Swiss-Prot record, chain A:
Phosphorylation by TBK1 is required to promote autophagosome maturation. Phosphorylated by ULK1. Pfam families: Folliculin. Component of the C9orf72-SMCR8 complex, a complex that has guanine nucleotide exchange factor (GEF) activity and regulates autophagy. In the complex, C9orf72 and SMCR8 probably constitute the catalytic subunits that promote the exchange of GDP to GTP, converting inactive GDP-bound RAB8A and RAB39B into their active GTP-bound form, thereby promoting autophagosome maturation. The C9orf72-SMCR8 complex also acts as a negative regulator of autophagy initiation by interacting with the ULK1/ATG1 kinase complex and inhibiting its protein kinase activity. Residues 312-364 are annotated as: Interacts with WDR41 within the C9orf72-SMCR8 complex. It is found in: Cytoplasm; Nucleus; Presynapse; Postsynapse. Expressed in all tissues tested. This is Guanine nucleotide exchange protein SMCR8. The modification Phosphothreonine is found at T246. One of its GO terms (cellular component) is chromatin. The lineage of its organism: Eukaryota, Metazoa, Chordata, Craniata, Vertebrata.
UniProtKB/Swiss-Prot annotation, chain B:
Keywords: Amyotrophic lateral sclerosis, Autophagy, Cell projection, Cytoplasm, Cytoplasmic vesicle, Endosome, Guanine-nucleotide releasing factor, Lysosome, Membrane, Neurodegeneration, Nucleus, Secreted, Synapse. It comes from Homo sapiens. It is found in: Cytoplasm; Nucleus; Cytoplasm, P-body; Cytoplasm, Stress granule. GO terms for cellular component: autophagosome; axonal growth cone; cytoplasm; cytoplasmic stress granule; cytosol; dendrite; endosome; extracellular space. Disulfide bonds: none annotated. Residues 145-285 form the cDENN C9ORF72-type domain. This is Guanine nucleotide exchange factor C9orf72. Its main location: cytoplasm.
Length: 386, 385
């Protein structure tokens, strides 16, 4: 909605949308001759109000006879531009140096598109709002602060991901144990034909996967192969297709799968009766525009990774406080930790029991599944849901 | 036609001038070997004055030629602030205390000239010089090393220090971040001001001020966390006037008695601020205690003191907690922002917001709601008032 243009004692050219429709009504000549030098103005730069709101008004010189030329901003409100003076000063005092240490060469238009691309990068990076830039500064500094737990869920296609995650969850029954299988370490082998449905289900459910390290994802998009245990090692959700068989030969690997069938509306995974996955994913949710839902899930998984950080780095749990260690004592003491303090119930202890192991493998050597392919599993019987 | 003042804790400023249509009076410190004379300040005030040809507008100017940075408000008349180009990041947090601190000077002096002025503005300029003299001397560092705080103490507290440590951080984060800690010594109030300043952004750190052992500071209505100590008699002064003039309410956290007092929420604070400002401009035309506790700060303070102190774990987990606080704030902003059509319809949607966003406790709603107000102003009036 906001505008950006030039000055001199009149308009030179618009840059935001190049003299667009009724979004731009007010004249630039109202802004012109009032943002120049009525004191007379070496690198002057100032900030007024002029109640739209007056904005950053870096005054520049060309010495050549055409000396008055300042470039000016404008936006909606006051504190967006006053509060962000530090990041509007040092991005126009350096973008002008293409023009300053540009056209200072030719007196003793080559860098014109440089200014008309850098300036578009300035309006594109300051396009959003005042709240969004403050939240992105705070999230930037805090993600600079923590450095271990960021890889687990650090990853606008996230809107299309989270919106299809919400359209997954409130429009598919028994998805609590599927998302439990994703968060627990059980390879969700998504099986079914009609490729694009499976791909959108894969990129929707890709948010919940705790990736191994500081590389991209363990997700696999639409593999077509018998899937012996080497694809179950390197990929934690797989997008197989039906051929009109594979369901019978795939059930031989029933210890490492959760076979979600699209053309049959069944799956095969253990029983989930816990409370963490229903608060990550409630059945009915009055949350609209699922990018908000992706912010909710990212906020919740940050707290989950904080619980896994806590369970990993407590000294009095993992170090045995005895001469000879007894796994009844340390297993019951770990279990007493995840029941009492963390407040987890009967499968969430398995979830945090897994994410802590990924966190150990990242901190110790920065290589799980590449040079240490662990693939921990369990003998819990999977039930055929219908 | 100028006066000179000399104060310990050397000045950051250069002068303070008033406009007529040039100078009428100059308030200057007694900084020995001043870098510049008076005529550049007078003629430079003539630069920043006559360039426009009701409310009170603000002007901000940075001169990289002589090396000054000018802040001024113009109402014909104009008050200006002269401070060098040696610092710019020093002033920029103090903008919202300097602007309103000079704006009420402009209101009362504007009515006082409307009844018809230098001696009625000596006592108005003389605090805001001492504020900037205080901020350079003590305020904070940005790097809060957490080795100096209540964290690392290996134990949260025996009987009452756990409840006071829960209510202090809890009531702090419920009251939009603004606090006042008062005491009779310096080391304890410094420990509570650093401990309580872990939970802020480094921009909001630079507003807040530490304690002072020797001289006399006062309350200010713009600092986030203040460490002003009590008198030798065992008392202090929190004036009812200027506490209302602060943009946010305030916790009166009191060490040595371990009580925690609060103020009403910020919609009633802005509303009663409008009541008291209007009803004090028509002349010649209260700490209500903590409502209820929370769950996130109880969980956090429960499970932090099991990690080790000196191994950089508590700061990591603390940054994770501030990360989930700010992300819950941003998804609360998004959920209000799309519940209505970004401020078209009235809100009417608190209950589903409380059950969906894991915020069924109101005392834990107030923290996320307070941060959401702090980086999106105008929510509490939209949903509560």
């Amino acid at each position: 909605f906001i505008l950006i243009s030039e000055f001199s004692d009149t308009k030179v050219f618009g840059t935001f949308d190049l003299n667009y429709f009724s979004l731009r009504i007010m004249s630039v000549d109202y802004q012109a001759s009032f943002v120049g030098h009525p004191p007379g103005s070496y690198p002057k730069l100032n900030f007024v109000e002029d109640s739209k709101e007056g904005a950053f008004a870096y005054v520049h010189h060309l010495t050549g006879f055409v000396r008055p030329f300042c470039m000016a901003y404008i936006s909606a409100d006051q504190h967006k531009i006053m509060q962000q003076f530090q990041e509007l000063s040092a991005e126009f005092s350096r973008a002008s140096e293409c023009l300053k240490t540009g056209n200072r060469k030719a007196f003793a238009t080559e860098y014109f598109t440089q200014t008309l691309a850098q300036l578009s990068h300035i309006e594109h990076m300051f396009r959003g709002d005042l709240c969004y830039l403050l939240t992105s500064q705070i999230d930037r500094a805090l993600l600079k602060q923590q450095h271990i737990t960021n890889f687990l869920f650090e990853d606008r296609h996230k809107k299309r991901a989270g919106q299809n995650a919400l359209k997954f969850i409130r429009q598919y029954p028994f998805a609590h144990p599927a998302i439990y299988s994703l968060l627990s370490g059980r390879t969700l082998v998504v099986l079914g034909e009609d490729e694009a449905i499976v791909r959108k289900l894969v990129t929707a459910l890709a948010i919940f996967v705790p990736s191994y390290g500081c590389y991209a994802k363990p997700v696999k998009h639409w593999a077509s192969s018998p899937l012996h245990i080497m694809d179950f090692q390197k990929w934690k959700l797989i997008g197989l297709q039906r051929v009109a068989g594979t369901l019978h030969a795939l059930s031989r690997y029933s210890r490492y799968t959760s076979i979600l069938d699209l053309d049959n509306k069944t799956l095969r995974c253990p029983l989930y009766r816990g409370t963490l996955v229903p608060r990550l994913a409630d059945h009915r949710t009055q949350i609209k525009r699922g990018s908000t839902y992706y912010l909710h899930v990212q906020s919740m998984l940050t707290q989950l990774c904080s619980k896994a950080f806590l369970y990993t780095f407590c000294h009095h749990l993992h170090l045995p406080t005895h001469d000879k260690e007894t796994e009844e004592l340390v297993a019951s003491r770990q279990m007493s930790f995840l029941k009492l303090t963390l407040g987890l119930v009967n499968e969430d202890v398995r979830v945090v029991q897994y994410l802590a192991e990924l966190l150990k493998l990242h901190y110790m050597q920065e290589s799980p599944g590449t040079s240490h392919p662990m693939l921990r599993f369990d003998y819990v019987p999977s039930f055929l849901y219908k | 036609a100028k006066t000179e003042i000399a104060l310990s804790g050397k000045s950051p400023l250069l002068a303070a001038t008033f406009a007529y249509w040039r100078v009428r009076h100059i308030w200057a410190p007694k900084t020995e070997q001043v870098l510049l004379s008076d005529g550049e300040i007078t003629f430079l005030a003539n630069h920043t004055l006559n360039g426009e040809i009701g409310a009170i507008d603000v002007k901000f100017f940075v001169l990289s030629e002589k090396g000054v940075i000018i802040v001024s408000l113009i109402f014909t008349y104009g008050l200006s602030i002269i401070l060098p180009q040696t610092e710019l990041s020093f002033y920029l947090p103090l903008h919202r205390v300097c602007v309103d601190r000079l704006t009420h000077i402009i209101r009362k002096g504007r009515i006082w000239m409307h009844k018809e002025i230098i001696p009625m503005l000596t006592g108005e300029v003389i605090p805001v010089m001492e504020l900037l003299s205080s901020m350079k001397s003590h305020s904070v560092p940005e790097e809060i090393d957490i080795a100096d705080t209540v964290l690392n103490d290996d134990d949260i507290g025996d009987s009452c220090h756990e409840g006071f440590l829960l209510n202090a951080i809890s009531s702090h984060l419920q009251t939009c971040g603004c606090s006042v800690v008062v005491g009779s010594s310096a080391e304890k109030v410094n420990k509570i001001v650093r401990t309580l300043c872990l939970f802020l952004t480094p921009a909001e750190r630079k507003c807040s001020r530490l304690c002072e052992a020797e001289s006399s500071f006062k309350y200010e209505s713009g600092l986030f966390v203040q460490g002003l100590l009590k008198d030798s008699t065992g008392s202090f002064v929190l004036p009812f006037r200027q506490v209302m003039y602060a943009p946010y309410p305030t916790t009166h956290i009191d060490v040595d008695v371990n009580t925690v007092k609060q103020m009403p929420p910020c919609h009633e604070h802005i509303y009663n601020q409008r009541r008291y400002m209007r009803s004090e401009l028509t002349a010649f035309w209260i700490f209500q205690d903590v409502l209820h506790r929370d769950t996130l700060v109880k969980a956090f303070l429960d499970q932090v003191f099991q990690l080790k102190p000196g191994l950089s774990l508590r700061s990591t987990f603390l940054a994770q907690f501030l990360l989930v606080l700010h992300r819950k704030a941003l998804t609360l902003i998004k959920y209000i922002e799309d519940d209505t059509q970004k401020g078209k319809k009235p809100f009417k949607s608190l209950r589903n917001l409380k059950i969906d966003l894991d915020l069924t406790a109101e005392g834990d709603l107030n923290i996320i709601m307070a941060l959401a107000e702090k980086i999106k102003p105008g929510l509490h009036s939209f949903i509560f008032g």
